[PDB]
Amino acid sequence: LQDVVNHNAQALNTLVKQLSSKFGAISSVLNDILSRLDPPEAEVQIDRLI
Amino acid sequence: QSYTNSFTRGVYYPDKVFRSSVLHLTQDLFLPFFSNVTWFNPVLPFNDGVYFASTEKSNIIRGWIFGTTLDSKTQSLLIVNNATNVFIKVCEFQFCNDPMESESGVYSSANNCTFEYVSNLREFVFKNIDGYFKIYSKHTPIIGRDFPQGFSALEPLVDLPIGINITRFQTLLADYYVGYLQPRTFLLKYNENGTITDAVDCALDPLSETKCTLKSFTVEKGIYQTSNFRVQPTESIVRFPNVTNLCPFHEVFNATRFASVYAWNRTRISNCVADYSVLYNFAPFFAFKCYGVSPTKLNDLCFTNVYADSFVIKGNEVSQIAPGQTGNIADYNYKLPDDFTGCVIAWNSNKLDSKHSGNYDYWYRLFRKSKLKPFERDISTEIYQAGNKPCKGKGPNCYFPLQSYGFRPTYGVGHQPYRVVVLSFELLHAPATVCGPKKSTNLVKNKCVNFNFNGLTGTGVLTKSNKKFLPFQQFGRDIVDTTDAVRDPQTLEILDITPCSFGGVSVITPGTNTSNQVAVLYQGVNCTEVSVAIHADQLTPTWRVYSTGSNVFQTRAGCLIGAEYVNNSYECDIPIGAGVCASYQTSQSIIAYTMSLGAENSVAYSNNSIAIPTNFTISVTTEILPVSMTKTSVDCTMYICGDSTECSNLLLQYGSFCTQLKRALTGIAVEQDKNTQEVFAQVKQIYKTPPIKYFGGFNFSQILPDPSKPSKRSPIEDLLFNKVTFNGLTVLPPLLTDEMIAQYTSALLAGTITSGWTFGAGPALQIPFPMQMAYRFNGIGVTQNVLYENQKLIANQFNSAIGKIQDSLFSTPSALGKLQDVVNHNAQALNTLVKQLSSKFGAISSVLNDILSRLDPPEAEVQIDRLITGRLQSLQTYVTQQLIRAAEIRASANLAATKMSECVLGQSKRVDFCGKGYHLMSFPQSAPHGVVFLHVTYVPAQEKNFTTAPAICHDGKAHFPREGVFVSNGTHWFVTQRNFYEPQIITTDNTFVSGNCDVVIGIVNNTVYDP
Amino acid sequence: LQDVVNHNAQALNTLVKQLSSKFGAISSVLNDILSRLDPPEAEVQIDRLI
């Protein structure tokens, strides 16, 4: 049971941590990309993050 | 000259790369198998490479001539072989040797010789490709004129970089066969020494397409999925509404004056044609960049709401004009949408948009108090207020937002004015109004045709429709958003767009070893449709099985060709669908029959009729169960990145994917270890079988370990073991060595055969085997007296039963099908994973080191990223597949553990769980990544039809057997156990009384004796 | 059983409905992309749809 709980917790923690992965893009936060670049290339960066 | 068949000739080495003992599938220009070959001074046209096989003994064939004209006008290739050295020239000659020391080369012309070169059954492949004349020469001097229908590869004699055009060629004299090549696909079997010992085409016969599909030269008996058939389009219609020709552009584009960048005119064009080639040369404007819709395709489905914008700018101003751009021009002159599907045309306009002294009229909106949005014009030219107080003129930052451009003809190129046309059009609105002219065609009339209805392009069958389009709807779709109805305004007729027929084809083959005939199943199609497609050369799988009579059958699965339907019934051999099955029968051919669901047996039920067996059989049946899987550990970094830190840095930005994959693989591995632990290690203490091994006639030699061999495995285990069977991927060894697993099996079996089932419920309790078997009879409703009264026979019944098991595992090679399937599945997964390392994934190359040593790292980053994404999706797919397979094997291992707990460590009352019959006992045997259970079952036999009755009325009261059944042989009545005929005289010992003789439906008068 | 049938039908319906998904490309139909763009540029859109 403890292993099941730990597995679910680890899955959720990995999912939230991977919100900070750049995934080969400029950054990991959408707002900085929006208020850093022009909308066209920002679209490609947001596409990679998505 | 006649026509013969190219049996297997024309195979050459496709490349100079060594390959050993492989089956490589390559697509290239080849001589197709069994093609028609002309056997012969004619001028043979050079069909993109020829196979020329000269058979001679007088050396009459002195060489070849190639070219397009061969009359000293275009460059022609002359090849001659005099006695020692091949003179190869690329000259421009009128004629040649054609009119010991009986002949010499005089030719007729030697102009512009651009290239020079010197060095029976002479085969020569001449392939002209990529500026190369590749000559593949096989000089196998056969001693004799017998033309062998055999195999001989053609090693590349030379690859001349002549780089000339060749359409025709002739032979030079002082017989021969000619065949023409086509682009085909071949399977070549490269031998150890590097030689192509055999080749298999991929377009002749269904059989030699499944040979390519499995990448083998010997296919097994079975239905094989293969390529998908599809009726190819017959014609190609292009229907438009009534069209008109106006083209009102050049008269506008040529005009004396356009408007400024801020005063631009949105010119609307409608009801004309896209005569745009004039804008290239008739109005020769140089700057032509089409964004969203590249040019030279502007002939149909082109414009719906085309608009034209007229800009007048400087020279160094078009650069800022692009979709998604920003700047003062973008801010306050005009703003473009990001999705601008149009064209930008710019050209210098000195003599037509400038004054000789300079025209100070083309101004621009320097400032404005309104943010520009896509497709909006600036009109207000009031002073741009820049202060909180009302700002008019000077004072605050305000200035007049209109600066004159000095369009002088004396300025440089960077200042010369540009006239610009922006064609902004939307390729969407369904109703149209403008594109170029094209041929129209009437209704296809139920014909699979390329349709081009008002720009809606596709392939389909256009039939009369009953769908009531209200007089504004042009298209008509379905819930799947597929256009199932269209109507051209010119015809104004609603017609549906049911697509061209397709599906798949599957090859039924009885195995290459058995035979070579095949059948084909076009899945889900009417046989009339497929026959019609055969007739008018429309089926994509160009190989045509001859549709003779009594060989085309229409099943609910589709159309089966090559096998006749027989109204007889047989067990299924090669499943097809809808209950039909095909098989090879004996003169010998493939037949399709309705599957017979076993025999039909009517049980003779009656009001009073029972059948009790008088004999039995100790059957031994093998049941194979996967227990484990190959533990595979994959190094994410090395697989994705070939020990490259440059690639590792890029991989590090992809989150903890490698950590997740490693965790999943380690979980799978520890799960495999726990699976074999739980299946085999259910015994606390390793039990040793006794020194003397007499078990009341029960043999137990093929299952008990024999010390006179290594690894201490049983002979059955030996047969099972002998019967089964880089780049960051590692196969971790199992924790339990095969000897340890065999020792667990030996302990389990020794405990079973010595202590009975007691060792599974606690301490092992010794008990003679003839007593344990009597208990196991008691456990299936058979009195123990049966065993001792028939001990020895049963022993033999067991012993022979085990003996056949060996042959069942010896003669039959597919007995261990499930375990070998598991092994093959793992091997195929690993093979696919390593093979996808060679996939470019839309990059420059499949090898990292090339990309590293080809480009600067900023540019190489994109290619490395594409390769990383491809290989990472490969890893994720492999890991997910492994997880699913591991879950399946976990279920199988749980079943195996349950069986060993219930079938081996005890006797199970669950029906058909430990065999087919009444379970007696079971024996485990280790096998590679699995277990094999020798389920011992009691099976009754030798029936005897008998008369019965639920109750006996002796003393005016009912009587019932305590555990048996009341039966009779006509005259006497006997109470007997219900699983073995043991008649007994009815007495109060076996009978109990309950009630009187007026409630039982079928009570019978009789005597219940007193003992 | 009805849930099993409906689940299979929903899976197939989703699979065919995502044929109309642009996937961040010009369009969801290959035919239009082919007869709208030169093959070097159309390669990117075809790759995205693929």
Ligand SMILES: *[C@@H]1O[C@H](CO)[C@@H](O[C@@H]2O[C@H](CO)[C@@H](O)[C@H](O)[C@H]2NC(C)=O)[C@H](O)[C@H]1NC(C)=O
């Ligand atoms: C049990 O079965 C084995 C068979 O595996 C018997 O061994 C055979 O013995 C005879 C002579 O006694 C030989 O001719 C055979 O070659 C043996 N079989 C094999 C496969 O080699 C054995 O006799 C049986 N009985 C006992 C008590 O072991």
Ligand SMILES: *[C@@H]1O[C@H](CO)[C@@H](O)[C@H](O)[C@H]1NC(C)=O
């Ligand atoms: C080669 O020359 C022939 C001469 O008739 C011509 O038809 C063909 O188009 C040419 N093609 C090339 C340049 O390969």
Ligand SMILES: *[C@@H]1O[C@H](CO)[C@@H](O)[C@H](O)[C@H]1NC(C)=O
């Ligand atoms: C205008 O028409 C003349 C006709 O001779 C042509 O030469 C010229 O290139 C045209 N220019 C434009 C911009 O259409």
Ligand SMILES: *[C@@H]1O[C@H](CO)[C@@H](O)[C@H](O)[C@H]1NC(C)=O
């Ligand atoms: C647009 O209209 C204006 C009206 O003054 C005119 O001067 C200009 O030449 C026109 N430009 C065109 C024809 O695109």
Ligand SMILES: *[C@@H]1O[C@H](CO)[C@@H](O)[C@H](O)[C@H]1NC(C)=O
């Ligand atoms: C195939 O077509 C024929 C003629 O249209 C028709 O009679 C037959 O019923 C069709 N087959 C099936 C299975 O519907």
Ligand SMILES: *[C@@H]1O[C@H](CO)[C@@H](O)[C@H](O)[C@H]1NC(C)=O
């Ligand atoms: C069994 O008995 C019933 C009594 O109603 C009778 O109808 C039926 O025919 C009998 N079955 C036989 C004689 O096979």
Ligand SMILES: *[C@@H]1O[C@H](CO)[C@@H](O)[C@H](O)[C@H]1NC(C)=O
């Ligand atoms: C029962 O069957 C066996 C073989 O299956 C046979 O040898 C035997 O004679 C039969 N009868 C008895 C009474 O065992």
Ligand SMILES: *[C@@H]1O[C@H](CO)[C@@H](O)[C@H](O)[C@H]1NC(C)=O
């Ligand atoms: C057993 O059944 C058959 C029919 O299958 C029948 O002919 C026979 O008479 C029955 N047995 C007896 C004891 O009558």
Ligand SMILES: *[C@@H]1O[C@H](CO)[C@@H](O)[C@H](O)[C@H]1NC(C)=O
């Ligand atoms: C029935 O079984 C008895 C057993 O004693 C035997 O004597 C008799 O011959 C058998 N047959 C008939 C028709 O009674």
Ligand SMILES: *[C@@H]1O[C@H](CO)[C@@H](O)[C@H](O)[C@H]1NC(C)=O
């Ligand atoms: C059974 O025996 C009793 C008394 O002997 C008699 O009354 C009854 O009718 C008998 N029943 C049958 C079915 O013979």
